[PDB]
Amino acid sequence: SKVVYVSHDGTRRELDVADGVSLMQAAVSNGIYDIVGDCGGSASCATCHVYVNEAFTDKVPAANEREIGMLECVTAELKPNSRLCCQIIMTPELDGIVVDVPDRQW
Amino acid sequence: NLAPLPPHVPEHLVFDFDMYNPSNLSAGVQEAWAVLQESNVPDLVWTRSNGGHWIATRGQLIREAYEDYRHFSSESPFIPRSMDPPEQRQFRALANQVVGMPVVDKLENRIQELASSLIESLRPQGQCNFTEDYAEPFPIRIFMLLAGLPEEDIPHLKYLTDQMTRGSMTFAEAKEALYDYLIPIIEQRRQKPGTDAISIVANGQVNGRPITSDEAKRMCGLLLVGGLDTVVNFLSFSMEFLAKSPEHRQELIERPERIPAASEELLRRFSLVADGRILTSDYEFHGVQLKKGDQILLPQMLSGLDERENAAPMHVDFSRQCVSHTTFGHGSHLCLGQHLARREIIVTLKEWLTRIPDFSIAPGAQIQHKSGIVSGVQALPLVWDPATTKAV
Ligand code: HEM
Numbered sequence: 149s150k151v152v153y154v155s156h157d158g159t160r161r162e163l164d165v166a167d168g169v170s171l172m173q174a175a176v177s178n179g180i181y182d183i184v185g186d187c188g189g190s191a192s193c194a195t196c197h198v199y200v201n202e203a204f205t206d207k208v209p210a211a212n213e214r215e216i217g218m219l220e221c222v223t224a225e226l227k228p229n230s231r232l233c234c235q236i237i238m239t240p241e242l243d244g245i246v247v248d249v250p251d252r253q254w
Numbered sequence: 255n256l257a258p259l260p261p262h263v264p265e266h267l268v269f270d271f272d273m274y275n276p277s278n279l280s281a282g283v284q285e286a287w288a289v290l291q292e293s294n295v296p297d298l299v300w301t302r303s304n305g306g307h308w309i310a311t312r313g314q315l316i317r318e319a320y321e322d323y324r325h326f327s328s329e330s331p332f333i334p335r336s337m338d339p340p341e342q343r344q345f346r347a348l349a350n351q352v353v354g355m356p357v358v359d360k361l362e363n364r365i366q367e368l369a370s371s372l373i374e375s376l377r378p379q380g381q382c383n384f385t386e387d388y389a390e391p392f393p394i395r396i397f398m399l400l401a402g403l404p405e406e407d408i409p410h411l412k413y414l415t416d417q418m419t420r421g422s423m424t425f426a427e428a429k430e431a432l433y434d435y436l437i438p439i440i441e442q443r444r445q446k447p448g449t450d451a452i453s454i455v456a457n458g459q460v461n462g463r464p465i466t467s468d469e470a471k472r473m474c475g476l477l478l479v480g481g482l483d484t485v486v487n488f489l490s491f492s493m494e495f496l497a498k499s500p501e502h503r504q505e506l507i508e509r510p511e512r513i514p515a516a517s518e519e520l521l522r523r524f525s526l527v528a529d530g531r532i533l534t535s536d537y538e539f540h541g542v543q544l545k546k547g548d549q550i551l552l553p554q555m556l557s558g559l560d561e562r563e564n565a566a567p568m569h570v571d572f573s574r575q576c577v578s579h580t581t582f583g584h585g586s587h588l589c590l591g592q593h594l595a596r597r598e599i600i601v602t603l604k605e606w607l608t609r610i611p612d613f614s615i616a617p618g619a620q621i622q623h624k625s626g627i628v629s630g631v632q633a634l635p636l637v638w639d640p641a642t643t644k645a646v
Pocket residue numbers: 331346353476477478480481482484485488526527529530554580581582583584586587588589590591592594595
């Protein structure tokens with residue numbers, strides 16, 4: 149199943165991502181250094197911040213309350229489609245999902 | 255040596271567990287802790303040992319408690335018995351510059367050569383104390399590499415780190431000697447920098463201004479010491495296990511691509527850290543009344559041994575579908591060294607199995623485990639037929 153990571157500088161990383169793995173985890177495993185994932189994926193750090201493409205923003209299960217509180221601390225611009233990618237779990241229905249990665253996590 | 259039951263602790267929650275000397279230690283330390291998860295043991299118990307404290311026994315509680323920093327504070331993480339979140343975040347930002355995934359990936363080739371150089375000097379002897387001969391010198395040499403320290407400084411550093419874990423010197427004295435070794439180096443590399451760990455720390459910024467030499471040496475000291483005991487002992491649990499499981503060895507030899515996954519299953523099965531938190535206020539937690547100031551042990555090792563989280567938890571299955579553990583911790587303080595630790599383990603298994611595919615525990619040897627905040631292996635004598643090895 150496939151995921152596209154668009155960096156801030158326009159750079160593109162297309163990635164094959166197994167089902168069940170979070171979008172954070174696939175990124176950190178594959179050289180996508182503009183996603184940090186410091187807390188290791190429990191919505192405790194906000195350093196896995198991404199912007200979900202509008203076409204998929206409603207296909208993804210809603211952020212729970214812990215994710216929403218954590219999102220208030222992102223260091224880049226907080227947008228309506230900001231998500232913590234450790235909380236986005238890859239599924240076949242998300243095939244081709246595009247996420248844009250902020251210019252900073254720290 | 256037991257403490258009196260506090261008024262608010264009900265008798266039916268009392269459980270006899272000494273985390274420094276558990277009853278069934280000879281079956282192995284993970285086995286000794288799993289008695290906390292036998293069939294009618296409560297999810298949250300109280301022991302009279304080591305001053306008296308709570309122990310959460312299930313991954314569900316352990317995760318919840320580590321996520322709830324508001325009730326469960328890290329001001330006192332050890333049994334028996336800090337800095338604000340804004341400084342904490344900046345601390346972790348800098349540590350991630352030093353030891354984050356980008357650093358590890360580009361460091362991997364030199365880690366691999368070190369692992370190789372270490373094993374090749376061992377291979378033609380046909381025996382070793384793995385703990386003393388590989389497990390201990392490997393991570394300390396990896397730190398020198400990361401920090402750009404010269405090879406001839408090891409026996410001194412080796413000596414100082416051991417005294418924080420062992421000789422003839424207070425812990426405070428050993429820490430100061432380690433600090434006193436770092437400060438001249440920090441000052442030299444400050445403002446006139448390189449790309450090594452020490453230069454990066456020395457040139458870091460905190461609250462808009464340069465990191466002080468004091469803040470820098472503690473950060474440096476902490477990155478050096480935090481990566482020793484846990485790595486040394488985890489490698490030994492792992493290599494002890496492989497020595498006893500020829501079939502598991504063969505799987506990785508025939509399919510070296512499964513070694514990262516195998517590494518994750520060994521991290522679940524031979525998990526080894528247990529610290530905790532302290533209650534910031536009175537709190538009703540899963541039907542249990544905790545009082546302000548109570549200490550609660552939240553053993554990172556027990557989440558992955560929990561049968562409610564992993565079917566047949568004592569079984570090592572390298573093809574295990576959903577590996578669940580909290581071996582590097584959980585929540586905001588999850589191990590900032592996890593990417594370096596994983597690469598060290600993966601490189602070790604690969605470079606060892608490539609050269610020394612066949613080995614066992616030395617005949618008659620009793621492998622003794624030790625229990626504590628970081629559990630470990632006392633000694634690991636291995637033997638092998640040197641003609642069955644392969645120089646690479
Ligand atoms: C198998 C190897 C390792 C294991 C299993 C492990 C385990 C852990 C655990 C469970 C914690 C969290 C403790 C808590 O929340 O109370 C932690 C924290 C920490 N570890 Fe690791 N660790 C390992 C290797 C390393 C390495 C290689 C380093 C190198 C720098 C390191 C440095 C640290 C530091 C500095 C902390 C404090 C993090 C914080 O308080 O924010 N550890 N480790």
